[PDB]
Amino acid sequence: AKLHDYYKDEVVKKLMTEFNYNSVMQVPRVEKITLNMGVGEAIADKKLLDNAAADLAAISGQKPLITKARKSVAGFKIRQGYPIGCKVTLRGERMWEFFERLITIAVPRIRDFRGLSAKSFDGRGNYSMGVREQIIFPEIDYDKVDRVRGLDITITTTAKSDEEGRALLAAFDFPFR
Amino acid sequence: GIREKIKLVSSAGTGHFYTTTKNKRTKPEKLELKKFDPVVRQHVIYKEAKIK
Amino acid sequence: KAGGSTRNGRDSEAKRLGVKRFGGESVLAGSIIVRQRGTKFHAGANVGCGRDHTLFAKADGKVKFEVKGPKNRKFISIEAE
Amino acid sequence: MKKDIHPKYEEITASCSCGNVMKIRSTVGHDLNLDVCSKCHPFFTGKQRDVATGGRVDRFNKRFNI
Amino acid sequence: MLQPKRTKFRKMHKGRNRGLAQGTDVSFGSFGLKAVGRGRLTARQIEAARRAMTRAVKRQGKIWIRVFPDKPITEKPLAVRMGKGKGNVEYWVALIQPGKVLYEMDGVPEELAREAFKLAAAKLPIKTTFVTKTVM
Amino acid sequence: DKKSARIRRATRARRKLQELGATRLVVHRTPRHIYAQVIAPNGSEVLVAASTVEKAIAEQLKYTGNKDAAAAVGKAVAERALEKGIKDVSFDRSGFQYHGRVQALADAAREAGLQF
RNA sequence: CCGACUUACCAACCCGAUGCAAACUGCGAAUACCGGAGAAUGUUAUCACGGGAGACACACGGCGGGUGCUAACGUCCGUC
RNA sequence: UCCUCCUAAAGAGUAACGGAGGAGCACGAAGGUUGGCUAAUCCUGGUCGGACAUCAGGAGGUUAGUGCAAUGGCAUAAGCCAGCUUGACUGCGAGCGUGACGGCGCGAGCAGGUGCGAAAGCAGGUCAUAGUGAUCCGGUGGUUCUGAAUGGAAGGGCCAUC
RNA sequence: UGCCUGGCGGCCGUAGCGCGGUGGUCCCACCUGACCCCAUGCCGAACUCAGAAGUGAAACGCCGUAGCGCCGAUGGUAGUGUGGGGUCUCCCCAUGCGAGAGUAGGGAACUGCCAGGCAU
RNA sequence: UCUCUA
RNA sequence: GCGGGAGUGGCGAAAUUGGUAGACGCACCAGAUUUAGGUUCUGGCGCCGCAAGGUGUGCGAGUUCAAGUCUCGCCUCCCGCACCA
Numbered sequence A: 001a002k003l004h005d006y007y008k009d010e011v012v013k014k015l016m017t018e019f020n021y022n023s024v025m026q027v028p029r030v031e032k033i034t035l036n037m038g039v040g041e042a043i044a045d046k047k048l049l050d051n052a053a054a055d056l057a058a059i060s061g062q063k064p065l066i067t068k069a070r071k072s073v074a075g076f077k078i079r080q081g082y083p084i085g086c087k088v089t090l091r092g093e094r095m096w097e098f099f100e101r102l103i104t105i106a107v108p109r110i111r112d113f114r115g116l117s118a119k120s121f122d123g124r125g126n127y128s129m130g131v132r133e134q135i136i137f138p139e140i141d142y143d144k145v146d147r148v149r150g151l152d153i154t155i156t157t158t159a160k161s162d163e164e165g166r167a168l169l170a171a172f173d174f175p176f177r
Numbered sequence B: 001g002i003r004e005k006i007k008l009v010s011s012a013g014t015g016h017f018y019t020t021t022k023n024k025r026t027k028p029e030k031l032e033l034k035k036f037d038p039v040v041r042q043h044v045i046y047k048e049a050k051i052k
Numbered sequence C: 001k002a003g004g005s006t007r008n009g010r011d012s013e014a015k016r017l018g019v020k021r022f023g024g025e026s027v028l029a030g031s032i033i034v035r036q037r038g039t040k041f042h043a044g045a046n047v048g049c050g051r052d053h054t055l056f057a058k059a060d061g062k063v064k065f066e067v068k069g070p071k072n073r074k075f076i077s078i079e080a081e
Numbered sequence D: 001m002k003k004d005i006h007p008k009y010e011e012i013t014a015s016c017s018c019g020n021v022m023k024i025r026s027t028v029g030h031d032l033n034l035d036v037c038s039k040c041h042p043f044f045t046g047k048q049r050d051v052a053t054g055g056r057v058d059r060f061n062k063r064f065n066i
Numbered sequence E: 001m002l003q004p005k006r007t008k009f010r011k012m013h014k015g016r017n018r019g020l021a022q023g024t025d026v027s028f029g030s031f032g033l034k035a036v037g038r039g040r041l042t043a044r045q046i047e048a049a050r051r052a053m054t055r056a057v058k059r060q061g062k063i064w065i066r067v068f069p070d071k072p073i074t075e076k077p078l079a080v081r082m083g084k085g086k087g088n089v090e091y092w093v094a095l096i097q098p099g100k101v102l103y104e105m106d107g108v109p110e111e112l113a114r115e116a117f118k119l120a121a122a123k124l125p126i127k128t129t130f131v132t133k134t135v136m
Numbered sequence F: 001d002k003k004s005a006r007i008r009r010a011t012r013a014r015r016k017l018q019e020l021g022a023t024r025l026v027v028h029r030t031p032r033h034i035y036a037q038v039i040a041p042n043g044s045e046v047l048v049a050a051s052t053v054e055k056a057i058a059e060q061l062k063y064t065g066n067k068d069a070a071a072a073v074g075k076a077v078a079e080r081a082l083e084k085g086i087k088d089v090s091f092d093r094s095g096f097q098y099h100g101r102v103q104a105l106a107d108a109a110r111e112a113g114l115q116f
Numbered sequence G: 001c002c003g004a005c006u007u008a009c010c011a012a013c014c015c016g017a018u019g020c021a022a023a024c025u026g027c028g029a030a031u032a033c034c035g036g037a038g039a040a041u042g043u044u045a046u047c048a049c050g051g052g053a054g055a056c057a058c059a060c061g062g063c064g065g066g067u068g069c070u071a072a073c074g075u076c077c078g079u080c
Numbered sequence H: 001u002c003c004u005c006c007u008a009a010a011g012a013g014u015a016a017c018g019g020a021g022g023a024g025c026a027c028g029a030a031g032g033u034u035g036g037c038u039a040a041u042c043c044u045g046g047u048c049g050g051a052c053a054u055c056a057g058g059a060g061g062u063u064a065g066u067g068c069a070a071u072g073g074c075a076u077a078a079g080c081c082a083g084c085u086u087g088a089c090u091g092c093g094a095g096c097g098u099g100a101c102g103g104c105g106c107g108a109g110c111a112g113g114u115g116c117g118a119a120a121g122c123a124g125g126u127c128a129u130a131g132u133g134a135u136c137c138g139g140u141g142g143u144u145c146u147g148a149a150u151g152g153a154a155g156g157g158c159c160a161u162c
Numbered sequence I: 001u002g003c004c005u006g007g008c009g010g011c012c013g014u015a016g017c018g019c020g021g022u023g024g025u026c027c028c029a030c031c032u033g034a035c036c037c038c039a040u041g042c043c044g045a046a047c048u049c050a051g052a053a054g055u056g057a058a059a060c061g062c063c064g065u066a067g068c069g070c071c072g073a074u075g076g077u078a079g080u081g082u083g084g085g086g087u088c089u090c091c092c093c094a095u096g097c098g099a100g101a102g103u104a105g106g107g108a109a110c111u112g113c114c115a116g117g118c119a120u
Numbered sequence J: 001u002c003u004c005u006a
Numbered sequence K: 001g002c003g004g005g006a007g008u009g010g011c012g013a014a015a016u017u018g019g020u021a022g023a024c025g026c027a028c029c030a031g032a033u034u035u036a037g038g039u040u041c042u043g044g045c046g047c048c049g050c051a052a053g054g055u056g057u058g059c060g061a062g063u064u065c066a067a068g069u070c071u072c073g074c075c076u077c078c079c080g081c082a083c084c085a
């Protein structure tokens, strides 16, 4: 909650200034962070899903919710009900502490890191990014793992527009560009 | 008509039985239900037997 | 020049549905009012709904058709008599 | 949160090559020694330098004098 | 020849053709060919009267067709007894009531529309008349 | 949203008691207060009512939205119902869980003398 | 690799206008039918039980329709 | 043979070698109850990932879903998740519907005993309408009801069932 | 008695959407926190509990507004019961019933019980 | 063991 | 005219319970043998290309999460019946 305290003291005052909001509840704030691994290859074996959930349980200290197919499609050879991915919803202090470890440790551990995109805010403030490789987190041991996974991060905030979330993450020095 | 027919014999010693069907392929384990026995006027566990 | 047929010879028996007792019509308890498939009508006061959505009288009295609810659904109730 | 199903999430210390000592809560358990942090990552100087196009006319005039 | 691409059902009852029509006013164009009689127009009769006014205008102006043949008409073959199912669909008609505007036209003069619709009405079994766009 | 889903969550048992002709105790629960009212089987008029918004109940309490306030409310509405001769009702949770403050209210009304 | 633009070969959605439907309906009659009340009329015309049957090859005409060619002194239904 | 729609003429019913489609099952949970939930499709952003897996937001508002044909229903959901369970109870049944009949159907309530729920209450199979076969003969279990001099027994009867 | 709010109804769009504005003493809402009651096929998001620092941003409530939705005559038309008639695949006459669509227009609901707050 | 033809 | 069956690469021919479409072989192409051809031997082979995937079971619509693989219509072809006065 270190960044939550930095939010509550300096980000709200900053955004109230740079938007001239009437109320303090009108400010944006982060709400949840969603960590998906779409594992479409677990129809080959359950152990790839079962081990990908084990790695992401190490990243964020929660047991992931194993997601399944909403319906059946044949182009991917899947039926309605197959476990096909895993997700983790992060809220509260565990959200802030993951977001600290993210922007402080893991984003610098990206190979050839050169910035993020400011064109990934889904028109309504919610930001979504995707990492190529789970080894950027130091929770994962490099010798111990075998398969390169990948996940995607979805920061859901209460900003109505796209720029109010862009200014919010920039207030958290989120490395856009 | 693969769903064969059985009987649910009272475990109260009476020869009373309910008759019903099951898929013995997909449900190989035996059926046991707690049903009313009108001779003893109690609810007693019935067990699967052959319809004979 | 002989030939033909008709793959379309079938039909089922008429189930004799409908409203057996109309409005303002005094009934006994248990009397079938409406036989129907769905709930084209709905059960109101002193009116039960059967297994096949049959509307029967739980008491004695006159049949009252009325439209209630936000969906303007048709309810059947038994007035006292 | 539930009790048993989650992994251990304990506050440890992660120090870096720039000396950025940072205490975080993690599932590692042991203490952590880093290589680059967000303070010392060359995102604000190095990636700006690392384009380095260079001039072709300037290369030509560099190679000699008339 | 006009014909529906898809149909919900392949065959239809014979029905009747009583009542007045609905397409009464000249909606789109300036001049119209209005049905006075009653009957059914096939797709061949529609396309022949279209050809006769397209050629009579030298593709000058714009021609609307207000009707569309959507009723299938069955016939039994020759030397087939009256039982053994409904006959085979042979052609398509449009039921025409009195007052139905059959065609519309603009971009041409009035006398040219008169002689074009007269050449078209000579291809139609029913009695027609000439109408113009009425204000209100 | 939350209000509507609570109403959808309540409107089955409300219509069931509507056709049962049941005199019904209605609980309404807020984070700060808790409300109770005894409603005639026509659903259009009340008989007794109690709350933590009343002074005679709220001034004896620490906080208006805890379990002790909810039990004091169910006691007051039961003692008013027995004063008016209403004894048998049916408890309407009004889309809440029978848990916590709602359960402590209904247990207080059962203990004070109402029968449901 | 990015593409540069302009055609007249078309075109989804949407919008506006216009038609059609036995197996379409956000509308909806006349009649008919069921129940109740009230006169006048009618040789109880009504119902129940019992004794005795005959009949179960229909026809045309009107109206509403299926089929056929809105053909048949055609055929199959409803009603008189 | 059975079910659904139209023909069928706004109660029921209504024919043709008339127009179109299905059934001859399934389920020990796909039943009961309590609690909770609410779709299809499309748009944008997003690792592998692609027209289409999973994830987040938004439009939409049932255009989806219902074990299967069609019709009528369904948000209080009859649709979808989870917990506990066996009411897929036995004896009856006022009163009606439907048939020429055989027969078929709906049913509140009563007695006993039971499950869920705090409780009011609900439950006598499944959203409903198809999923079926008379009698005879014979088989199996139960029952002293009968038992051809008498005591048994055989055989028969009754109940369940094939 | 006036205003405002909460709960439960009646009625079921003249009652619904949209657009603009507006509300915080109380109430309501968001909210703060969660070791506990309880909960997440992960997550105090929801459910629940302990509360009251902040805000009316959202939601909700109120006011206004005819872009819709909705309602909707009068007259006429269609149809049709009975009787009659014709040029009889379809129409007409007498009489009785009389739509739908559309038009003028209406229209930004009304109302009951209880409780609370501020005024009177 | 078989093995055509220019 | 009625009934039954089938239509798939250049060719003959396969696929099951609807889960890639070409198994196979023939022919063709290329390689090595041989003076050379044939044979014999090895390897490829349905259409669009960068190598990366898409079109494709008579024609055209439906069903299905998904069809040669269901269902309807159309088309051509093969077979048997087309009798009684």
Ligand SMILES: [Mg+2]
Residues within 6 Å of the ligand: none
């Ligand atoms: Mg119709």
Ligand SMILES: [Mg+2]
Residues within 6 Å of the ligand: G056
């Ligand atoms: Mg006979």
Ligand SMILES: [Mg+2]
Residues within 6 Å of the ligand: G056
């Ligand atoms: Mg006869």
Ligand SMILES: [Mg+2]
Residues within 6 Å of the ligand: none
């Ligand atoms: Mg006859």
Ligand SMILES: [Mg+2]
Residues within 6 Å of the ligand: G065
């Ligand atoms: Mg007739």
Ligand SMILES: [Mg+2]
Residues within 6 Å of the ligand: none
């Ligand atoms: Mg006829």
Ligand SMILES: [Mg+2]
Residues within 6 Å of the ligand: G072, G074
């Ligand atoms: Mg005739």
Ligand SMILES: [Mg+2]
Residues within 6 Å of the ligand: none
């Ligand atoms: Mg005749």
Ligand SMILES: [Mg+2]
Residues within 6 Å of the ligand: none
């Ligand atoms: Mg007749």
Ligand SMILES: [Mg+2]
Residues within 6 Å of the ligand: none
């Ligand atoms: Mg009828």
Ligand SMILES: [Mg+2]
Residues within 6 Å of the ligand: none
């Ligand atoms: Mg009728």
Ligand SMILES: [Mg+2]
Residues within 6 Å of the ligand: H030, H126
């Ligand atoms: Mg079910």
Ligand SMILES: [Mg+2]
Residues within 6 Å of the ligand: F012
């Ligand atoms: Mg419920």
Ligand SMILES: [Mg+2]
Residues within 6 Å of the ligand: none
């Ligand atoms: Mg995508």
Ligand SMILES: [Mg+2]
Residues within 6 Å of the ligand: H126
């Ligand atoms: Mg069920």
Ligand SMILES: [Mg+2]
Residues within 6 Å of the ligand: H127
């Ligand atoms: Mg069903």
